[PDB]
């Protein structure tokens, strides 16, 4: 009493879309379309480290800070049309929960409903991209630091 | 899919770094060189372009080398001695290639050899690619 | 009149007679092989076709050699061991060339070498021709 043939057609189409989306982003060119993040042709920036220890002992551990994001976003040329950024939801959550010395936020300072819906027109969030935090297990207070060379976000 | 491009656009070696090989071009109506660097250079290496013609003893063996003349283009000036030459610049990286071709045919054979055979000349390779078959 | 064929169809040395050179096919979407003889043969020389993955320590260096697998066509038998191989027969004259190719790409680098190194093997030359680029 159910249309199993139509269900299978829909399932096959859904699988095709899901695989195509992973391709064009990470696929290699041997049997799948080559993705931009795998080709790695876009110029890259490298976040500055931090000496978390003492001046007498330079530790130079990796770190990520809000003004690094600000510099990255403001460094894009204005000639190249209208830019849009792509990133991961965990990264957005990490970015939106930073606080200054007085304990108040510094992104969406006075908003009680800050959410990706507000900035949807400049920032695109998809969970298929690499996640530097690895399920909120790195970068926080008391946790192991980030891993050098990790992907954070791309703009183009 | 991928094709059998060697059927229509064959290529032959011309300078493997120690010896030159005359290449017959009579059966094809176009051609061009292709330079590659296998290790970083130390100084500019100039190349000389020669051409041969059928020997008297055997019509299928090239004769002695003859230096190809120059044909000035409408927006340039002739070379000092009026003979063609090729110069590979110092800035060529190990991971890049160059391509250039002569404007005229002259004889049915051709070859390319360096001006001086030294340690820098061994760092280059030259190949000739045909295009179009008249038979 | 004449064309700079080397811009669209670059070719690279693969087997100069004494050494094997990896060739990067990643930047081009099709390729082929071209075999030529420089002296008379005495016994059939079989060749092995390989491919290399990217090296772990440096992404711009090829890794270890891996042997290409076989892919049967519509109707036909697979190789005895399932791998790809090429054989140059005795009848080939010094004035002719043979062309071939592989139906599938696999790794980004490609290579070729004889099964054995001897007097007969050193008399052959192999070159790889690329078709239009994609970068």
């Amino acid at each position: 009493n159910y249309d199993f043939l139509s269900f299978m057609i829909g399932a096959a189409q859904r699988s095709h879309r899901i695989n195509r989306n992973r391709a064009l982003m990470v696929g290699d060119g041997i049997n799948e379309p080559k993705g931009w993040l795998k080709e790695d042709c876009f110029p890259t920036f490298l976040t500055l480290p931090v000496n978390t220890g003492t001046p007498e002992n330079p530790v130079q551990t990796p770190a990520f800070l809000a003004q690094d994001w600000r510099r990255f976003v403001t460094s894009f040329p204005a000639e190249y049309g209208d830019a849009r950024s792509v990133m991961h939801q965990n990264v957005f959550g990490y970015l939106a929960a930073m606080v200054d010395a007085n304990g108040r936020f510094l992104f969406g300072d006075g908003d009680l409903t800050f959410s990706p819906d507000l900035v949807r027109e400049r920032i695109r969030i998809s969970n298929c991209l690499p996640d530097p935090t690895e399920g909120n297990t790195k970068g926080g207070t008391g946790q192991d630091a980030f891993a050098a060379g990790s992907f954070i976000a791309a703009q183009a | 899919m991928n094709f059998n491009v060697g059927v229509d656009f064959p290529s032959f070696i011309a300078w493997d770094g120690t010896t030159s090989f005359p290449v017959k071009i009579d059966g094809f109506n176009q051609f061009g060189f292709t330079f590659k660097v296998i290790e970083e250079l130390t100084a500019d290496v100039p190349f000389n372009i020669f051409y041969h013609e059928a020997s008297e003893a055997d019509p299928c063996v090239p004769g002695p080398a003859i230096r190809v003349p120059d044909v000035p283009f409408c927006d340039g000036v002739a070379t000092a001695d009026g003979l063609a030459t090729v110069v590979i610049p110092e800035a060529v990286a190990v991971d890049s290639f160059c391509a250039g071709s002569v404007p005229c045919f002259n004889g049915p054979w051709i070859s390319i050899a360096p001006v001086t055979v030294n340690a820098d000349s061994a760092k280059v390779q030259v190949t000739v690619t045909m295009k179009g078959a008249t038979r | 009149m004449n064309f700079n064929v080397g811009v669209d169809f670059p070719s690279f040395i693969a087997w100069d007679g004494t050494t094997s050179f990896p060739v990067k096919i990643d930047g081009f979407n099709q390729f082929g092989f071209t075999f030529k003889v420089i002296e008379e043969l005495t016994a059939d020389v079989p060749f092995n076709i390989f491919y290399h993955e990217a090296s772990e320590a440096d992404p711009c260096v090829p890794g270890p050699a891996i042997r290409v697998p076989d892919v049967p066509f519509c109707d036909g038998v697979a190789t005895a061991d399932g791998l790809a191989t090429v054989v140059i027969p005795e009848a080939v004259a010094v004035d002719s060339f043979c062309a071939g190719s592989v139906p599938c790409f696999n790794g980004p680098w490609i290579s070729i070498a004889p099964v054995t190194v001897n007097a007969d093997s050193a008399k052959v030359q192999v070159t790889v021709t690329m078709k239009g680029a994609t970068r």
């Binding site: 080709e39 042709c41 003004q67 990255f72 460094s75 | 120059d70 990286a93 890049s96 160059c98 | -």
Partner: peptide
């Protein structure tokens, strides 16, 4: 005379030239 056409590299950047962003401005 011959004019050589050459392409940047076989790879876009065999070793990608990543660069540190411009340093901090001031206090």
């Amino acid at each position: 005379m011959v004019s050589l056409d050459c392409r940047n590299t076989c790879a876009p950047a065999p070793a990608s030239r990543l660069v540190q962003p411009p340093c901090f401005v001031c206090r």
